[PDB]
DNA sequence: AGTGACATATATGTCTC
DNA sequence: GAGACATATATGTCACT
């Protein structure tokens, strides 16, 4: 995923 | 545990002046000889015999044992809000880091840890080691049992959620996947009740910003406004406002992909950027602006 | 219901008898058939190693008498917590109302700490000033005295702390030297997990500066500002954050004397509050900035 | 108490 | 996947001093 | 109170499908 799917 | 309760027990029967001869009655529920082997502790009451014991006692079975006894030490739940609630973004480091506390968090606590709590740092871990889907295990073989369940569930929980969250991540970059199962569980997660329990809402948010960069991938904005407008409802009924810049950034590729308004694009991107800045991330705001950059805008 | 109450937990966690029982060292797959279907009584051994692997506490399993508080108050709880009035009285009015919603539906059920909390926190709403409102001694005798005495500091304690702070605020005489005891135990308070619990001592830090400013005793303020940092980091509740620079930029102003640095941090606290979206408290921020002269 | 520590 | 058979463990009762 | 022996129940191992 992308960075801002990162949130964890 | 043995004379914790038989501690008890002794404690509440003197300070009542009642005598082990008068509780104990007739003996047609219990007798002294058993009562002082409960008391000293050479023995653990059976259930049926500690209600006699509550009930003579005036209180209710719950009362002598109400300690919160097998309770998890509040540095777990300091170091799984550390896993939580502080976003990588995928950074090396950050992601490196939560690894390294997973293992320092199992190794602490996992003869007291519940079920539930294990598989949150299992899943966790796989979703933060996760690289790529050619060499990341498909969440089919890691959690087989597990995601045929959630194939099937209606209301998720948060473990269910994170599994989820894994099969979004194997599901990015690849073709020829199972495309009607991807838009079911798009309208499962959209239709999830938001309460008060931040990690669930976190792992919430974390699928909605799968969801859309999947749809972004896939070139599918349909009902993709519908996933921005949930994921803002988690950040304002949590105030939560650390994964705000994210969907700033989304409503930007919504106007750079769908709209064809770079204008706009452009304009939702430097309001996550100030965001993030006023935020002080600095892992945030030079991937924002490495996005950006990447997009052709400013 | 002993067998049924392990038995339906079990199965809504999707557990299997194998998974609960692991390597059968505690408790075996045939004695959990036996447990759950009624044939045995389970031991508190047992039944202890069980509520560890559900993670319910044993109370949880076997309370005939056990009342479950529904989602809907602590989504009430949350609304009354975490978003912060600023003495609006709009916000103030909504919250008040509210409250009493929250007690006619949930009185029965409710714990005397949880309407200790809701007691203590209409109070500190509603709060008008020092001379109208109820003394803090004359409702929160006991509470306040234990205060005195406690080291540690609960919820509740901090709560009564705030309202003891929003009294305090506008009396030109006071007991000084109680107030420097208070301040150095809120200081020494270890930020939790509980988001309600760094919420409220937020609040008192935050009093504690405004005591401060109204006293003109800027000893020690640098290091509340730095511990209503520390709350704002662990706990990543950034809607208190412009608070913190109103904070910084008081310093500046009335402390340091250093105009262009204090206007620097007000202008801060305003950006902060516009990408929250919170006019209320930009519109205050700003009002604040042009009454201290800049 | 003035508004900035009016966070409830 | 739940069974039943049978031994063992533990709590409990009934003496005994 | 405490030790001795018997009993009821919980639990474990085996065996079977």
Redesign the pocket.
Same mark, same amino acid.
């Given at each position: 995923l992308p960075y801002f799917a990162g949130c964890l | 545990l043995?004379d914790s309760i038989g501690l008890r027990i002794k404690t509440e029967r003197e300070r009542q002046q009642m005598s @082990?001869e008068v509780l104990?009655l007739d003996?047609? *529920? =219990?007798?002294? @000889?058993?009562? #002082? @082997? #409960?008391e000293?502790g *050479? !023995? =653990?009451? !059976?259930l049926?015999? =500690?209600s006699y014991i509550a009930k003579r006692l005036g209180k209710s079975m719950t009362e002598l044992l109400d300690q919160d006894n097998i309770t998890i030490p509040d540095e777990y739940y300091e170091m799984k809000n550390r896993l939580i609630k502080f976003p990588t973004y995928r950074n090396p480091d950050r992601i490196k880091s939560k690894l390294t506390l997973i293992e320092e968090v199992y190794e602490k606590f996992f003869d007291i840890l519940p079920e539930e709590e294990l598989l949150t740092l299992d899943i966790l871990e796989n979703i933060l080691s996760f690289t790529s889907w050619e060499e990341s295990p498909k969440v089919e073989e890691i959690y087989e049992d597990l995601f045929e369940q959630v194939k099937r569930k209606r209301k998720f929980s948060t473990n269910d959620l994170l599994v989820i969250d894994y099969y979004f991540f194997h599901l990015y970059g690849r073709k020829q996947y199972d495309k009607k199962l991807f838009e079911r569980i798009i309208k499962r997660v959209l239709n999830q009740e938001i309460w008060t329990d931040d990690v669930y809402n976190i792992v919430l948010f974390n699928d909605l910003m799968a969801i859309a960069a999947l749809k972004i991938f896939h070139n599918s904005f349909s009902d993709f406004l519908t996933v921005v407008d949930k994921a803002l409802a988690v950040i304002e009924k949590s105030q939560l406002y650390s994964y705000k810049p994210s969907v700033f950034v989304l409503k930007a590729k919504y106007e750079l992909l769908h709209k064809e308004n770079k204008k706009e694009a452009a304009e939702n991107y430097d309001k996550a950027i100030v965001f993030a800045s006023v935020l002080e991330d600095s892992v945030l705001e030079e991937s924002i602006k490495a996005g950006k950059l990447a997009d052709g805008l400013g």
């Open positions: - | 043995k @082990r104990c003996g047609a *529920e =219990l007798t002294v @000889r058993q009562l #002082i @082997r #409960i000293k *050479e !023995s =653990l009451p !059976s049926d015999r =500690l």
